[PDB]
Amino acid sequence: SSLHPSIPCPRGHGAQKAALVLLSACLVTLWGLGEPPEHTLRYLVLHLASLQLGLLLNGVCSLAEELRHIHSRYRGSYWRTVRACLGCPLRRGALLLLSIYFYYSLPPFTWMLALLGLSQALNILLGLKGLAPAEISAVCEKGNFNVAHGLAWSYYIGYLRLILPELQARIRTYNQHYGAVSQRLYILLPLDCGVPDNLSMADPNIRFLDKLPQQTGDRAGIKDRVYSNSIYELLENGQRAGTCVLEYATPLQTLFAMSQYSQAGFSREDRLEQAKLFCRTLEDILADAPESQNNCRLIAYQEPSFSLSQEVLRHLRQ
Amino acid sequence: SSLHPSIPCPRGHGAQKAALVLLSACLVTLWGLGEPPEHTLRYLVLHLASLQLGLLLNGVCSLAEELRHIHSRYRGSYWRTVRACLGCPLRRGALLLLSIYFYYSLPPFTWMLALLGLSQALNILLGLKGLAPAEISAVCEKGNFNVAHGLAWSYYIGYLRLILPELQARIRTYNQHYGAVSQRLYILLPLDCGVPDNLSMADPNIRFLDKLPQQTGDRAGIKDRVYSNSIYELLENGQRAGTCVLEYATPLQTLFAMSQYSQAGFSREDRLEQAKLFCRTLEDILADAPESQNNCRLIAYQEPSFSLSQEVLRHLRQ
Amino acid sequence: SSLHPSIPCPRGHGAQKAALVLLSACLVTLWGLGEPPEHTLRYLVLHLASLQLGLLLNGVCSLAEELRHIHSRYRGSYWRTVRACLGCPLRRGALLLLSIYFYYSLPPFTWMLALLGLSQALNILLGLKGLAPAEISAVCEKGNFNVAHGLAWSYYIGYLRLILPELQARIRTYNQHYGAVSQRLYILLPLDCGVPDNLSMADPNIRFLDKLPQQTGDRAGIKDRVYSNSIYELLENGQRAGTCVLEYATPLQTLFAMSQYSQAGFSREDRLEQAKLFCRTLEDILADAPESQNNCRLIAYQEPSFSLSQEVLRHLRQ
Amino acid sequence: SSLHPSIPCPRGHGAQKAALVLLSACLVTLWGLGEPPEHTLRYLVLHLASLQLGLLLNGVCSLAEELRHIHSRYRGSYWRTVRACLGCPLRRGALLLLSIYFYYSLPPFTWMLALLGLSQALNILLGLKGLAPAEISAVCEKGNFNVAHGLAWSYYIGYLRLILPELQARIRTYNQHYGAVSQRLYILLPLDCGVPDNLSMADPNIRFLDKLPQQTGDRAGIKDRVYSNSIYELLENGQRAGTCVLEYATPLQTLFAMSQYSQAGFSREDRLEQAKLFCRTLEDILADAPESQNNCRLIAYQEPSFSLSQEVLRHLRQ
Ligand SMILES: Nc1nc(=O)c2ncn([C@@H]3O[C@@H]4COP(=O)(O)O[C@H]5[C@@H](O)[C@H](n6cnc7c(N)ncnc76)O[C@@H]5COP(=O)(O)O[C@@H]3[C@@H]4O)c2[nH]1
Ligand SMILES: Nc1nc(=O)c2ncn([C@@H]3O[C@@H]4COP(=O)(O)O[C@H]5[C@@H](O)[C@H](n6cnc7c(N)ncnc76)O[C@@H]5COP(=O)(O)O[C@@H]3[C@@H]4O)c2[nH]1
Ligand SMILES: COc1cc(C(=O)O)ccc1NCc1ccc(C2(C(C)(C)C)OCC(C)(C)CO2)cc1
Ligand SMILES: COc1cc(C(=O)O)ccc1NCc1ccc(C2(C(C)(C)C)OCC(C)(C)CO2)cc1
């Protein structure tokens, strides 16, 4: 990571390595105990069969609910619903038949089935199937089930992809028709999502200069939609030090407000996590984005004293 | 849902009813088999103990990974990381002690622990911890782990919350200076996420008439950010039939773009699901929003034959 | 499929269904034979262990070669090379340890290892590991290891994506400055890849009318790269019937020529298969392409008599 | 490879040498264990028979799917489909008869057949037939199942084969009418697939000077298709140092675009590999091409610092 140390890096395969260590330790233990190795395989297969049967029971329980959404979620198809509730039906059926064959045959199946169903019903009714926070976060980042992902892609697709290509032209026009504004757009990324509408209320040194010429385009059925970029003066010890096109990242305002509305179901820990995820995703997008031909810089900072103007000037004087 | 029948309703408790029926059936089956309830209780407790030990081992394996993000994601606290990997540690410890006690007491513990660890390691290494699509969708909707949620809240907070209060004044100003446009902002919600940049290209009857009295204000370091809302005339049979403010929902354009980009990890089925989720979320927000004092009207439509102008005129007349 | 009946449809899951049927039949057979079920599991696990060991041996054999390409293919990393030769090392190691534990323990490991290595060496030296044509084709279509995929994406990205958006404008300009040319671009897709440079040499009825105004753009460091679309007159019984912008698909010329150069290693059966795959992929691309707002039609035909002008007029008169 | 060291050389026979060493080691081990060669031969033949039966069963399972494409992909011939699913049927039948004979004869066949079918069905249903990345890459390179192959052959056939013969005449015409440009077409092969639409944006020294005497001809129904090749001056230290015809390879732009689109199923590692494969294939083609009579020069470069103009001037001077 390079934006800010607080930004987490993508998760690796540490869990699989721990699993391999656990497997080795368990095999060594079973070897030490000196137990009939055929029993080990027998009972492991029985345990996996129990897991498969429990998955089947929970899947039918969830199907009881998902069938009410068949015509809206699954195109009125029962096969798609069954697949959503039990994975691939062919593999699940194959493993179910293997379980049945290797339980009835290896040294009652109906009693075991009743017990597994009782356990599954107890877990479902009491809500014991809740995923751990780490598992939920891993599932969300893996499949990009996050608001920050969509916000970053909206910021790139809706604003940056349509502004950065025509940013140098407007800057050169302003320079011709008027100071030495830095030839880039600097985006502030407050991880606290404290985005004021005025940069002068954050740091007095950051003062408002003139503005770039408006950019107009037809967007989503709105004729001549306006995009305006403001130019700000950076004051050091009361004297101007540098000029640049500065602006906060607006989606952080949405992240902050969502933590203020109870209807959003968005907590403050979620706010921080999604802000950092937004920063990471935006950096990843800009890395491979062809529009960003050195036309944008991301400035992520955290408030513990702190001077925003100093960070901007550090990123400018490099 | 009144927008479109294709919008799926929120999930209920069908899984709970199915679990209750399964519980009753399993109790009946155990009664029929004639075995005494004491053995059933013993083996049920043993199965739950095995589940608890498996959870412990999986949490240890996942902690082996989450400890790498202790400082960035967990604020340098080992308690928080362990909690994320094992839920509330106190409850987990209590249940583990219960499991150990009711194993050593109920007719070798270490061997079963090794077997369970072997099974968990096999599940982790072979990627058998996968959660079914229905489970993942339910976990996301309950926790609002979706891009559509953030996009809808950004659209409401970013644009509607600032435009709807001042829309009546702008429309009245436009009328006094010329115009019998309607007193609502009509929003198009294509479930296919088409969103062309010009309405007339989707339906020739939709023809641009004139703009509105531009609204401007400060927004996240941008001075005089301009908000534009255009007016379109609704042609019908070659002559005018209605006029109002009409514009697409840009977050759907963002969703469509995300499906085109591979860096987003966003599919087209996910695109449709997230578009419908966005529509439902925006519907739910405007219902309880103080700003939507009858000042907006959401229009959702799936392209089969059909005419956008006809849909808008139907929503106007009706 | 709709382009042409000869175009294959994507492969389904028939192999998995046949596998499930085979599994059921084998389980029924084993049950009928009345054999100790523990032996079945024992020998199945032994067979899978043998397969894992054979995979390990073949993987090290292939690593012996892939290590020579470590600095060019795998970024000078040995871990990446090992992963490319043996899949995920963690899972492979786990299954190897399971094999070792459940072979030495279930009723010589070194003799079996030597025999498996001998078999693997015999297969490698004699070239017995060759994949069947169906398996190769499935692997290629699954991962898009095909020339036709790249050719279709080049045709869309390089030509259509930069022509179709500005096609109606040029057609309207020609109509103003001059007949009733159809308002679309019609692309011929001869599955035999017999693409002549002159449409009049194929069918005399297809005659050359004037041409659309040139389209110019800077492409790949070439200033004002020219794109020219020709207009052709469709003669029926000696009299004009319709006008349209017609052109063959050029990548078919490359497909044909590649079958003429031995240096290409491209056969005629490969030519036909890749031509049909190109047609399918182009249709799939245009289906979801936003540029194709009814601006292009694909005309795939096969020569058994046949009149190209008749097919063009059939697609025009619809 | 002289283009760039990062271009991997074609694979050799290292796997064969490794297999030979493994064979020798296994023979030595079997000699050491002291078992007679007769048992070794028996069990080796049994193992090969098991492999043959597994191939038979997998081919039956895959035929259950390929029979759906008998008419579209196999020309309505069952023999061709069976051959694609089982290689040459005669050899497969001979080997199966040998297996049956040497099983019934060498100290229950149907039980082992059922076990092998169970194993094959498990492998198919669980998706265990996956081929390692090295194996897939070798199969693709041997069979030229790559997009880069088709792109390179299209670039040579489509553009170079038509431009190189007439490039000298055009350059001479340009010189007589004005100019000391070089007598070769220089092609840039960025392994990162950047390919900006204007050279000066990648290096300010690369400045457009003038075009050439446009070449035109008929191409796949396009009358007077125009081929343009621009001239760029190579600045060095503020004054001219060299002039020649310079243009990027557009197939690399196609590769980059394919990686941006999700519908392509094209990754970025695959992008780099296919770019290097394209460069190698184009190098191999021009070596034996009658058209490349010293009329072209390929320049490959990976962006580390480095200057494109410096690379071009180095290739010119040297
Ligand atoms: N600093 C800045 N100046 C701009 O001109 C601008 N325009 C867009 N954006 C930001 O890029 C992202 C993409 O916007 P998108 O249109 O896809 O969703 C937008 C869009 O659907 C709607 N909306 C906002 N402003 C307008 C507007 N002027 N006209 C029409 N719709 C608007 O409400 C959504 C949220 O906007 P913001 O959450 O305040 O910041 C946006 C957004 O984060 C801008 N950011
Ligand atoms: N009918 C038609 N008229 C055109 O103007 C045209 N321009 C491009 N194409 C086709 O689209 C596809 C994309 O071309 P790409 O540039 O990515 O690769 C091209 C490009 O790298 C190079 N090339 C061909 N023509 C030119 C040209 N005029 N200028 C520079 N490079 C060219 O050689 C490749 C193969 O071209 P064609 O294989 O004959 O047909 C192309 C191609 O199939 C055209 N097709
Ligand atoms: C990716 O493949 C898998 C997918 C899934 C899934 O879809 O959930 C689960 C497990 C998968 N592979 C591991 C595995 C498969 C099968 C068995 C087996 C034997 C065939 C050992 C005889 O043991 C008993 C059994 C009833 C569990 C099934 O058969 C053991 C282990
Ligand atoms: C995705 O899961 C798989 C991946 C791969 C692969 O990477 O090739 C192969 C197989 C995978 N699942 C199936 C599977 C079956 C059986 C076994 C097992 C028992 C766990 C029975 C005890 O028996 C046979 C063994 C000793 C060899 C290993 O252990 C394990 C797994």
Curated annotation (Swiss-Prot), chains A, B, C, D:
Q: Where is this cross-link: Glycyl lysine isopeptide (Lys-Gly) (interchain with G-Cter in ubiquitin)?
A: 17, 142, 223
Quote the annotated effect of residue 225 to A: Abolished cGAMP-binding. Abolished ability to induce autophagy
Q: Please provide the record's keywords in A-Z order.
A: Autophagy, Cell membrane, Cytoplasm, Cytoplasmic vesicle, Disease variant, Endoplasmic reticulum, Golgi apparatus, Host-virus interaction, Immunity, Innate immunity, Ion channel, Ion transport, Isopeptide bond, Lipoprotein, Membrane, Mitochondrion, Mitochondrion outer membrane, Nucleotide-binding, Palmitate, Phosphoprotein, Transmembrane, Transmembrane helix, Transport, Ubl conjugation
Q: What is the effect of changing residue 154 to A?
A: Slight decrease in c-di-GMP-binding. Renders the enzyme sensitive to 5,6-dimethylxanthenone 4-acetic acid (DMXAA) drug, leading to activation of the STING1 pathway
Q: As annotated in Swiss-Prot or TrEMBL, what is the tissue specificity of this protein?
A: Ubiquitously expressed. Expressed in skin endothelial cells, alveolar type 2 pneumocytes, bronchial epithelium and alveolar macrophages.
At which positions is 2',3'-cGAMP bound?
Answer: 154, 159, 225, 250
GO CC, any one term: endosome
Could you say how this protein's activity is regulated?
Activated upon binding to the hydrolysis-resistant 2'3'-cG(s)A(s)MP, an analog of cGAMP, in which phosphodiester linkages are replaced by phosphothioate linkages. In contrast to mouse protein, not activated by anticancer molecule 5,6-dimethylxanthenone 4-acetic acid (DMXAA).
**Sequence ranges on the Cytoplasmic membrane side:** 1-14, 67-88, 127-318
Note the topology in the membrane: Multi-pass membrane protein
Q: Which GO terms describe its molecular function?
A: 2',3'-cyclic GMP-AMP binding; cyclic-di-GMP binding; DNA-binding transcription factor binding; identical protein binding; protein homodimerization activity; protein kinase binding; protein serine/threonine kinase binding; proton channel activity
Oligomer and partners: Homodimer; forms a homodimer in absence of cyclic nucleotide (c-di-GMP or cGAMP); 'Lys-63'-linked ubiquitination at Lys-142 is required for homodimerization. Homotetramer; in presence of cyclic nucleotide (c-di-GMP or cGAMP), forms tetramers and higher-order oligomers through side-by-side packing. Interacts (when phosphorylated) with IRF3; following activation and phosphorylation on the pLxIS motif by TBK1, recruits IRF3. Interacts with RIGI, MAVS and SSR2. Interacts with RNF5 and TRIM56. Interacts with TBK1; when homodimer, leading to subsequent production of IFN-beta.
What's said on domains? Answer: In absence of cGAMP, the transmembrane and cytoplasmic regions interact to form an integrated, domain-swapped dimeric assembly. In absence of cyclic nucleotide (c-di-GMP or cGAMP), the protein is autoinhibited by an intramolecular interaction between the cyclic dinucleotide-binding domain (CBD) and the C-terminal tail (CTT). Following cGAMP-binding, the cyclic dinucleotide-binding domain (CBD) is closed, leading to a 180 degrees rotation of the CBD domain relative to the transmembrane domain. The pLxIS motif constitutes an IRF3-binding motif: following phosphorylation by TBK1, the phosphorylated pLxIS motif of STING1 recruits IRF3. IRF3 is then phosphorylated and activated by TBK1 to induce type-I interferons and other cytokines.
Listed name of the protein: Stimulator of interferon genes protein
Recite the lineage of the species: Eukaryota, Metazoa, Chordata, Craniata, Vertebrata
